[PDB]
Amino acid sequence: AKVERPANVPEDRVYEIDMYALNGIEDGYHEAWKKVQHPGIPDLIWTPFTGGHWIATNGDTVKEVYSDPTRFSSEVIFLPKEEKYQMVPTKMDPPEHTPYRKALDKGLNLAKIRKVEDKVREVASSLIDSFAARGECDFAAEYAELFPVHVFMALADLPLEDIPVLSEYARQMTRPEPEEMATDLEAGNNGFYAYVDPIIRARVGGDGDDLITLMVNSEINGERIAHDKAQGLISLLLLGGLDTVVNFLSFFMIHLARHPELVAELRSDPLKLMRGAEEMFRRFPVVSEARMVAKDQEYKGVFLKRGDMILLPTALHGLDDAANPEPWKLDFSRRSISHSTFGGGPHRCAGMHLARMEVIVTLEEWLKRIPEFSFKEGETPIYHSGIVAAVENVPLVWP
Ligand code: HEM
């Protein structure tokens, strides 16, 4: 399914790139995006796949497209253009976006995340305890996939024995399953809604500092937030911290499994581990959402029309050597860490302080128990591209 070239796309900007099926994806997600970003590639290219859209191809363009809601709107953020779930406020621009973002920040700000450290550490040390003694696990299935849900429960103050039902709804909400995932999506979305509904009402007026009470008792323009807007926000809190983290955790663990020497460095320098979370985010970005050109305008040599879509592969910032010299090296002494792994502008990831915390703590709790490890011989991870980079089959071994 290719669309005809529109009149505002010159011939020399056309590249045949399927964001869901990248040339070479089986050698890795980052490798495959980077093979797109050949030397001399124009800042903005265009593809007939996935509805036809432009793609920002370097750090400079990704940053700029991410950070000007006047020129590039969150009205449509997914490709292909199709959208029934608002997921507010991820599709609002300022000023609409702003009070919803303020509710989100009440649960996710840096000072708040500090106090949640011990619970996150308790999750990580628990998960790892399950298999430390074995000398083997599939990191993807036995840690990565389990960790974010477990963190949500602690953060939303939810009974741990509801993990099976929430995991099911998350599976349906994040990776739905022709051409009716409509039904699959709705099972996830509606089920989660029914699940949280009474906790929302019992937590109004409440004094807990969990995410649900925090969201439900928030104000939007002088009034307390609509019941359902609060449902939307809480659901967003669940999703946002799921798919990004599941996959991001596996990507760096794969890397560390294949770099025992880098493992020794971290293991020996606690503070260097702790201070190099940024470097990890630069090196393993996972998201490529989109912005909608908000109004006709000239940009990067071309004429964009209101309604055009620009894909923002965050991998093309972190791995851009115009931004970070020697971008393939995971360098914990890297002085200047330029990336858009969390996006930019007003929608810049609300979970970034949590994310940094989860990744550091995972890594500390990992090396306390498993100082040395490698990837199981004769195995290879399986990758997918799309909105969020996917990896599985991360069997790891240790003495
Ligand atoms: C590896 C970790 C993560 C990465 C790489 C990541 C990436 C991103 C990016 C790129 C965006 C911007 C989407 C856009 O508008 O284009 C975003 C938004 C968001 N993320 Fe994260 N994220 C991560 C972890 C988390 C976590 C742990 C949470 C916790 C709930 C979270 C919650 C959110 C929320 C609520 C938004 C919407 C913010 C807004 O639209 O104002 N994320 N994330």
Side-chain angles (χ1 to χ4, degrees):
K2 321 216 312 196
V3 100
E4 163 151 4
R5 190 177 75 249
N8 77 137
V9 178
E11 215 166 296
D12 58 15
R13 300 298 178 118
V14 185
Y15 286 64
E16 313 232 314
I17 305 155
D18 182 359
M19 72 182 275
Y20 291 104
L22 290 173
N23 178 46
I25 192 61
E26 67 291 331
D27 298 322
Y29 171 81
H30 301 104
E31 293 82 351
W33 262 120
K34 183 84 213 204
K35 293 165 192 314
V36 179
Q37 183 185 233
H38 70 245
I41 191 156
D43 289 352
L44 213 72
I45 61 175
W46 186 96
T47 178
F49 293 96
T50 328
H53 56 89
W54 313 83
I55 308 172
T57 62
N58 58 202
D60 185 60
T61 312
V62 171
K63 263 178 315 195
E64 167 175 38
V65 180
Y66 250 118
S67 74
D68 186 348
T70 315
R71 286 191 296 170
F72 319 103
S73 153
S74 282
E75 195 165 358
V76 185
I77 55 153
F78 299 127
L79 277 171
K81 279 200 86 190
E82 293 84 50
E83 114 233 73
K84 315 315 288 301
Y85 308 83
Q86 226 63 94
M87 264 281 111
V88 358
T90 62
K91 299 195 273 156
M92 286 153 180
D93 301 314
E96 283 81 13
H97 163 77
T98 306
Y100 292 100
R101 186 45 193 255
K102 134 67 26 252
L104 298 180
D105 305 327
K106 305 216 257 42
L108 289 175
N109 72 256
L110 200 163
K112 191 81 169 43
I113 298 313
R114 181 185 39 88
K115 300 161 166 180
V116 110
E117 196 196 293
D118 288 343
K119 293 184 171 201
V120 174
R121 190 179 303 283
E122 209 197 358
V123 163
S125 60
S126 267
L127 288 170
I128 292 157
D129 204 68
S130 306
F131 50 77
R134 284 206 229 109
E136 68 190 63
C137 67
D138 177 348
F139 178 98
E142 297 175 66
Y143 191 98
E145 255 170 13
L146 266 32
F147 176 90
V149 65
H150 263 94
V151 160
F152 182 72
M153 313 301 278
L155 295 209
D157 179 30
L158 260 18
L160 279 197
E161 33 279 301
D162 282 357
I163 291 166
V165 65
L166 305 174
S167 308
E168 169 174 352
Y169 301 148
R171 202 294 295 147
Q172 302 153 182
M173 284 185 292
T174 64
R175 343 180 279 258
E177 275 160 15
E179 234 326 292
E180 205 121 352
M181 9 210 255
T183 294
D184 207 19
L185 272 173
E186 175 198 67
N189 286 312
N190 287 20
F192 186 67
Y193 182 110
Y195 177 88
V196 282
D197 200 85
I199 316 162
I200 284 160
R201 316 187 176 274
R203 298 211 189 151
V204 165
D207 54 330
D209 66 357
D210 64 89
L211 298 177
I212 286 147
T213 119
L214 246 23
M215 296 310 105
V216 314
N217 301 116
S218 284
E219 292 191 341
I220 302 296
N221 282 219
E223 298 152 329
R224 199 185 53 253
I225 191 165
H227 177 81
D228 84 290
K229 276 312 186 292
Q231 221 111 354
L233 251 35
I234 286 154
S235 143
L236 180 58
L237 292 166
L238 177 67
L239 267 23
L242 218 146
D243 232 13
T244 43
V245 174
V246 175
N247 289 296
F248 181 90
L249 288 174
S250 290
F251 278 115
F252 77 74
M253 289 304 276
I254 287 164
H255 200 92
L256 291 173
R258 303 168 162 184
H259 291 73
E261 212 71 39
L262 212 170
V263 164
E265 217 194 356
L266 297 167
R267 202 172 59 235
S268 77
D269 193 357
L271 183 100
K272 180 181 293 179
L273 186 162
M274 193 258 285
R275 293 290 182 221
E278 273 299 86
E279 172 58 353
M280 280 191 279
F281 296 124
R282 175 196 64 80
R283 180 43 183 81
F284 310 109
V286 291
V287 181
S288 30
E289 276 182 52
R291 281 305 177 266
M292 186 191 87
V293 178
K295 61 191 191 179
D296 289 7
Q297 59 183 278
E298 196 179 319
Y299 182 59
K300 291 293 158 147
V302 294
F303 185 86
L304 307 174
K305 290 181 69 217
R306 170 156 165 83
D308 287 4
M309 303 292 305
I310 307 176
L311 183 70
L312 307 163
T314 63
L316 292 196
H317 186 166
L319 297 171
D320 190 4
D321 69 6
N324 303 282
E326 307 200 343
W328 293 93
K329 195 200 184 170
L330 198 63
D331 187 2
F332 287 94
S333 306
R334 191 188 291 280
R335 183 171 291 259
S336 165
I337 307 165
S338 181
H339 75 72
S340 295
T341 286
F342 292 126
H347 293 276
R348 193 167 223 117
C349 173
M352 72 175 274
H353 317 292
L354 185 49
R356 158 185 190 286
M357 173 91 311
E358 301 174 317
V359 164
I360 299 178
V361 163
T362 292
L363 238 167
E364 282 158 359
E365 292 311 291
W366 184 270
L367 303 167
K368 275 163 191 181
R369 297 305 299 293
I370 309 170
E372 282 168 322
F373 64 104
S374 44
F375 202 86
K376 195 195 193 185
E377 215 164 71
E379 290 293 322
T380 187
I382 292 151
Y383 306 96
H384 302 276
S385 75
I387 301 293
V388 186
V391 220
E392 58 207 8
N393 190 57
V394 186
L396 307 176
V397 292
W398 59 91

